[PDB]
Symmetry: D2
Subunit: 461 residues, 4 copies
């Protein structure tokens, strides 16, 4: 009967299910929600448009939403991030999913449109779960009538939240959102420790390069740059860090990294003469982590050491100037999501040319494109937050509020600290960790409840 899906190969379903059964055992916060809320069915009647990397971890999120009563229609938010066995297992469970590894851009857009439309007409969606804001943008621009009946958006990523806050400032956001990224059990777990796990993993899978003893430049030292720099330093790389934010740069210095700029004195004068050629001529590996544009620009790429690896773990495909490389230099596929870019010109190359760079995942998320992204026990935190955020906005029923009541609730908000702590506690117990209970005297002394929350909203962890 069930045909409402499109995946690479449905015969991978049994493999996907074996990996989902393992992943459940690695996701105690998400499986804890599944057990706590099963009887109450808090997402009964929820119809969720989901756009996030169709991994095994996203599989456990989907099956938790469904176990709590939701229906979903799913796509990946990246052309290389799907695990074909995860997409097959979800299709085989009778869930609409449109995702495969190695989509074209045209197929990416088609997949999102297959979630929005059921049998050629808008689905009766009433919730959105987004990673990076592409689905959110398409609904606002192309399907405004659908947003009338949507109660909320839950957004995974730093870049997606930035796009929501821009819409809210400009008065174009039509439904409330939860900023899932800024839970501590997301931002200071997934963004940092996920990249610590998955960056060196992706570089090894793609290149099998020794990292020990080699020179890296990490562009950015936010949550992703911090985790990326550690991924590489812990392998024995000599890591230098670039930053525009002097507070983040101060953290890099204290963490034991040299803070450098690709530009002389940190100033881009619009010419190749402002590039620190001596510095870039020694770098074996550049990683972009910024959420910004052209932080590894054409003139940097021209100055890099021969056979340097270039990758992006931040956003989109334009942290590195891949457009410059597509226009000017010859691409030689080594294997999927690994290209040698020959700096000898556009029209062919010598197979034994020494003057190339290695680009991973065509300048798109390297951890998800060349490996499997973050591990289950880290994504547990992010995805437990996603479930709690879906429950919160679905129960508030914004779409059913009268105009005057909507105006008061139209916001981009974080989950309460108490929920962030309850997710953290399930993660700690998954490690076999034992938190201490405050005595009444101690709770009084520091001015908190024995139940928490334990820190004021200003606390930075």
């Amino acid at each position: 009967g069930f045909t409402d899906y499109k995946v690479a190969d449905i015969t991978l379903a049994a493999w996907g299910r074996r990996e989902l059964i393992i992943a459940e055992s690695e996701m105690p916060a998400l499986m804890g929600l599944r057990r706590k809320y099963a009887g109450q069915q808090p997402l009964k009647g929820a119809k969720i448009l989901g756009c996030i990397h169709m991994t095994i971890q996203t599989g456990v999120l989907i099956e938790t939403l469904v176990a709590l009563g939701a229906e979903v229609r799913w796509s990946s938010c990246n052309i290389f991030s799907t695990q074909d066995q995860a997409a097959a297992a979800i299709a085989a469970a009778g869930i609409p999913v449109f995702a495969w590894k190695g989509e074209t851009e045209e197929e990416y857009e088609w997949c999102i449109e297959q979630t929005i439309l059921k049998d050629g007409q808008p689905w009766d969606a009433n919730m959105v779960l987004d990673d990076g804001g592409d689905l959110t943008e398409i609904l606002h621009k192309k399907y405004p009538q659908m947003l009338e009946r949507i109660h909320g958006i839950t957004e995974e990523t730093t870049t997606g939240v930035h796009r929501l806050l821009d819409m809210l400032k400009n008065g174009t956001l039509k439904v409330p959102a939860i900023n899932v990224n800024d839970s501590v059990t997301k931002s200071k777990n997934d963004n940092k420790y996920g990249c610590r796990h998955s960056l060196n993993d992706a570089i090894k899978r793609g290149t099998d390069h020794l990292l020990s003893g080699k020179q890296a430049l990490v562009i950015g030292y936010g949550d992703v740059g911090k985790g990326s720099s550690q991924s590489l330093r812990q392998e024995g790389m000599i890591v230098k860090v670039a930053e525009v934010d002097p507070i983040c740069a101060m953290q890099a210095c204290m963490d034991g990294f040299e803070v450098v700029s690709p530009y002389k004195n940190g100033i881009n004068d619009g010419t190749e003469a402002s590039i620190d050629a001596a510095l870039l001529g020694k770098i074996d590996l550049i990683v972009t982590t910024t959420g910004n544009v052209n932080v590894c620009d054409a003139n940097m790429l021209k100055a890099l050491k021969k056979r340097a690896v270039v990758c992006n773990i931040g956003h989109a495909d334009n942290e590195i100037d891949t457009a410059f490389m597509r226009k000017n230099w010859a691409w030689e596929e080594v294997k999927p999501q690994v290209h040698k870019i020959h700096r000898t010109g556009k029209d062919g190359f010598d197979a034994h040319n020494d003057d190339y760079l290695i680009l991973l995942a065509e300048g798109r998320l390297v951890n998800l494109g060349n490996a499997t992204g973050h591990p289950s026990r880290i994504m547990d935190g992010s995805f437990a937050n996603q479930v709690l955020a879906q429950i919160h906005l679905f129960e508030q029923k914004y779409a059913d509020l009268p105009a005057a009541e909507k105006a008061k609730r139209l916001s981009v908000e974080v989950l309460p600290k108490k929920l962030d702590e309850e997710v953290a506690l399930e993660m700690v117990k998954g490690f076999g960790g034992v938190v201490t209970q405050l005595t009444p005297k101690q709770a009084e002394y520091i001015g908190v409840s024995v139940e928490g929350p334990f820190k004021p909203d200003t606390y930075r962890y």
Copy 2:
């Protein structure tokens, strides 16, 4: 003919001056402010009561405040934290200071009273710089009339800020304060990296013990606990972490520590039966980092491995139950701020007894008691913030405001992010770090100024 001081030994002044000249070269943010504001004299007319560890680093702070036009009267906020050469150098410069290493509690109170009183009468103070809140409490309880002429308090430490926020919530705070602690260039520099540097330093100076291969228990995993755990792990200790806050415990797990409780199932019901005797019987070193009371309690001390080291880098002398040890067990001074505590009874000890613990700094701040606290290049951040906070509150002139205007400004506030970034930039340049300048295109892409600030006020770093 200057006599308005009390220090251990004025003949240490020349040594103090030599170390102050080195410290100036290690404190570019603080010396940057000294050079930028010297001509403007923004603290002309300021009369500052200062109570903070009389170290070489505090010496550079005092001489910066004086260089910007202030008069000060100074004491230490801890009986063991004074560096006698720093106190001597400050006295020799004609600045009133009442501080020596190894004060009694009675001498500590006398020293604070000597700052408050000049020639037997209240000094015409109009500013307060505090670390831990003891001076703040004495002014509110004993000298309320003096607070009528005081424009503000600048408070250094987590515990001091907690005490200010309690006064504000109870309506007993009489003057506005700046929370210096919660500048990122304080809390996420000093509290973390300071303890990283100075905890293993103090344990080595006191005991000369090998740390590698030994078992530690760090109680707390806030900023101080994070830095403390790293101090020990980086030396090759096997570190276990205790926490009441599940988010901080999650961080400890992800950072590669086992999270344990001294109590079975984390429940302290006050009985010896609740103590995890198997765990505590393997611990060679306990460090308290909490700012809470009785987190290393009598029953834990009884269960500790023979010859374990016990120390506190958080607050006061009651994180460890030192009162229990003073009443019940015999103390053998090894050398100043190092005592063997013989668990054989309160009266006689055998010089060759094997059943003892080693207590550092009598359960008071170990980094400052057994070594020299944080290094100059870290305290640069904290003390640049102190100077900016003093300038801000002095210029606001709260004490001269009409009643209606006072009411609107009576708060506990942090410095603006822009100043936090300007401190960080001077610290980065001290390392020879080069921040990148955003292009206008990049600044517009992430919605910030090329000049910063670079992050929203919610950002946690």
Copy 3:
């Protein structure tokens, strides 16, 4: 019209060749030998039986031997270690190779036989290059007449060398050997840093498990155990180490590991009562590194935590008692080289059973089975030694010596320190490292030549 090979898929040749061209740029010592000796053709007339993991790195070794004039016939020394693209590239270059990933044991023996036989008769072999000693053993037991014409064996691995030294002690060794393992640029490069790179790589590829915060037990702390312990600790695992050698255990303690035994008091009396069930009940990962038998025995496997991962990076398939698991417990293939072993019985399992272990590479070398083994820039050292050792024994022409002269040369020897240093220098230059030249006065002061060797033969590095 070359057909003298058997590989998984000859159409993988182009991909293999792209990866060989990258590997050449990562192997400066091996490519330095290729360039230095090309003109001399020192292996002209050498006919080498090779048995070592048919990886990209082994590909560069093979083509170096051929570039120096050798003919070879090749097989893999492990049923899971072949990279099918590497085997294809070598076949497509017209080199006899019999190797694929996922051989049966019967296919493994048939592949070695295809190297020994050409067109149904013993090949006119005159050199052996071995890893683990299986080919060496087959020649001695089954083809002793072939050894009459063989000039020597060059042996890669600790276990293979141990087997050669046993043959020499028993007087059963028929040709001289070089112990390649005990070059410092092999043992203290490959064995240690190779495993550091490739152990966490293999565990991530097989399971995608988070390692940070979890408990590991590494059995052994020789070169492989040291590198393995670091692989895990650098990811944030809490690593405990087992050893029988108290000197290696001393090193583990000092390196910051707790040293534990699976057995109470370290005494394995073969009973379940001797197992430390509390210790094994907390372990998430066991790694064997010993080259010994039954160091993760049936009683340990029964006591392990549910869903623990078990793997071997040492030798054979019997460091872990895989025979006990094949007899007693049901194996569920997750994907190739990843099995769940259900401790509920032999005859099938509940798909949702929680009581299983995860076995990687069926208890055989996990780095080569679940990933790609050591990276090119590490194997450069091992394989430069292999080439120098082949040249040395081929030039000595043992098989052509009179009986009296044979007797004096029948030994298992290491390469001279001077060659070890010349390999190391090419590796250092590959990192862009610059070695200092001694002045004549300095060389005289420490009693060495400016050219080296720099250390006496007793030096341990």
Copy 4:
């Protein structure tokens, strides 16, 4: 009425004894020998000339030698290494010791002469325990009749052993020696992990500098350089390494250090033009670890960054060219064993001069000069070996052998591996480590006894 000593202050004895009693609890291998051999008095009649750093650790060694029946006469082998409380405690126990912190060179020679002479005439010495070979050299050159009656020398340090091997090769060594340094429980414990503990300790005590984020250059990567590099990297320094030995350089690369030379292309032709001014102009700290001469030369000192710290943890005072600095530049004592060296000229300096270096311990061993050297639990290994070596040579009674029998025993040898393992085992047990016992089957499989030794003499650990 014991007066046969010279120390700084006999009233420090009680403090010394308290620290000796603690040190006993940290030295289980040395205290194990004291307990095992007490009844047998193996050193009854031994009269030992001892020249080694008069630390608390040396005190426990001395009192073990005395407890086993020896008489000794002691001096320090370094002018800054004595702990005055240790020297006092040894004098107060009625043991001849001539040692204080801050000897002149003339006092150093006088102290050694006070051990050799008792009441103005040669002591009836029959054993030597030396560190660095100065006492050994004096006996050979000045007191050859005394060597007739001496049974052996036990030598602590790499440099001392090199001097013994030179005497043996030249036929000038008069008595046999044990090379204590090359026990694995010395060289790969003390030399490496001792410096790891004590290098950052000494730099903090001397300067209180932040190390995190600053640039270091470690000259040498033998056991001392390895431990020194780790001391600094673990604190967050960015460490570069220099070497002449390409094998040691390879290890530095793999351990995650950049390998550089102070000289362009590593060629030290004695010209200023050969200095890499750009490299040295960024270095905040140079540490020499070589046992060689002029490895931090005048032209390097001229090129160093302003306010760089320079120190030596290797040997003598001429690894750094201190003689050049004494001749050309003005020394300003900060405090004992800390000098600012003003590069503005020889005579006066400006108190606020920015152009200086900081020299620790006047270029002599920094760990012992500015802190307390290695900790008790590490020196346990070195000193257990010293005691075994004294017992071995004393029992052999070389001086009582006839000329022809002396000739066969005149050697420089190491202790047998079995004793090295027995020292290691006591050290492991002191950490609470549990070694596994081999089964009979396992011991047979790897060809060792269940009792050990576990490795061949060629094994490098």
